[PDB]
């Protein structure tokens, strides 16, 4: 199971808007573009695109610049669709790309946008029709249906998207196709004469998809004392912890269960 995903953010300024774009293979970033830069270009963020040709990066750059130009117009037109003023600032978000299942055939294709953080228009799983959140979004919908937009995007997602995803995965297999198991341990903190805290740690793992659950005598438990959002370590790996409050002497009842792709089998720890 893999994915290539692009994320664009166009933020209006009171002249040229700021256009930022990022691209990920799975949970690794490999490309960046920022209009607020001195001479904006496509910039690699992973070694397996650093040795691509200069033609490759010229082309990617040209398409980033064209998308920035287009997003200025888009912010204006959205301002028109919702009949908004011009003093306030707004945001256009775009996400598109392809997800391969474990087969590893195309599982899904994505082309969806957002205005002011709200769903705008999204290409459906069929890659043949559109979900518009608003009748205003249906202006765009009818524009695209008249132009057979879904057709072209199906051609890209089923075609060159999966091809360059597979090819990136190839040239970076030493990186992208090696899962790091979580290094795990448990900490303990007496709170009071009645309570203590167990905290189950998972560190240095890749990809970010992981499952941490506390059980009591073999029964999943929910109170807890927290489950924390999976966070980036800063070196390409991720972190997460799950903690629970327990009676101050019954720690042995409580086990921690870790599921991660890089583990040959789910792990069970305890303090």
């Amino acid at each position: 199971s893999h994915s290539m995903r692009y994320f664009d953010t166009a933020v209006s300024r009171p002249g040229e808007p700021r256009f930022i774009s990022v691209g990920y293979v799975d949970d690794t970033q490999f490309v960046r573009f920022d209009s607020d830069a001195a001479s904006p270009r496509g910039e690699p963020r992973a070694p397996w695109v650093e040795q691509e040709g200069p033609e490759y990066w010229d082309r990617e750059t040209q398409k980033y610049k064209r998308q920035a130009q287009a997003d200025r117009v888009n912010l204006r037109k959205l301002r028109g669709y919702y009949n908004q003023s011009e003093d306030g600032s707004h945001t256009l978000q775009w996400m598109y790309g392809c997800d391969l299942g474990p087969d590893g055939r195309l599982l899904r294709g994505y082309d969806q946008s957002a205005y002011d953080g709200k769903d705008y228009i999204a290409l459906n799983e069929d890659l043949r029709s559109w979900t518009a959140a608003d009748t205003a979004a249906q202006i765009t919908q009818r524009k695209w249906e008249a132009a057979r937009e879904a057709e072209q995007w199906r051609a890209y997602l089923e075609g060159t998207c999966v091809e360059w995803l597979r090819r990136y995965l190839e040239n970076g297999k030493e990186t992208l196709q090696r899962a790091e198991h979580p290094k795990t341990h448990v900490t303990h903190h007496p709170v009071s004469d009645h309570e203590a805290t167990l905290r189950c740690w998972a560190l240095g793992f890749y990809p970010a998809r992981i499952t941490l659950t506390w059980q009591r005598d073999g029964e999943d438990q929910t109170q807890d004392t927290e489950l924390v959002e999976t966070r980036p370590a800063g070196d390409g790996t991720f972190q997460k912890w799950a903690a629970v409050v327990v009676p101050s002497g019954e720690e042995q009842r409580y086990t921690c269960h870790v599921q991660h792709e890089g583990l040959p089998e789910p792990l069970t720890l305890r303090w």
């Binding site: 664009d8 691209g23 398409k63 888009n74 959205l78 598109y96 228009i121 524009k143 995007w153 060159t160």
Partner: peptide, 9 residues
Amino acid sequence: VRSRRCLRL
């Protein structure tokens, strides 16, 4: 690789 098509509303 980015698609040759731009988002256009």
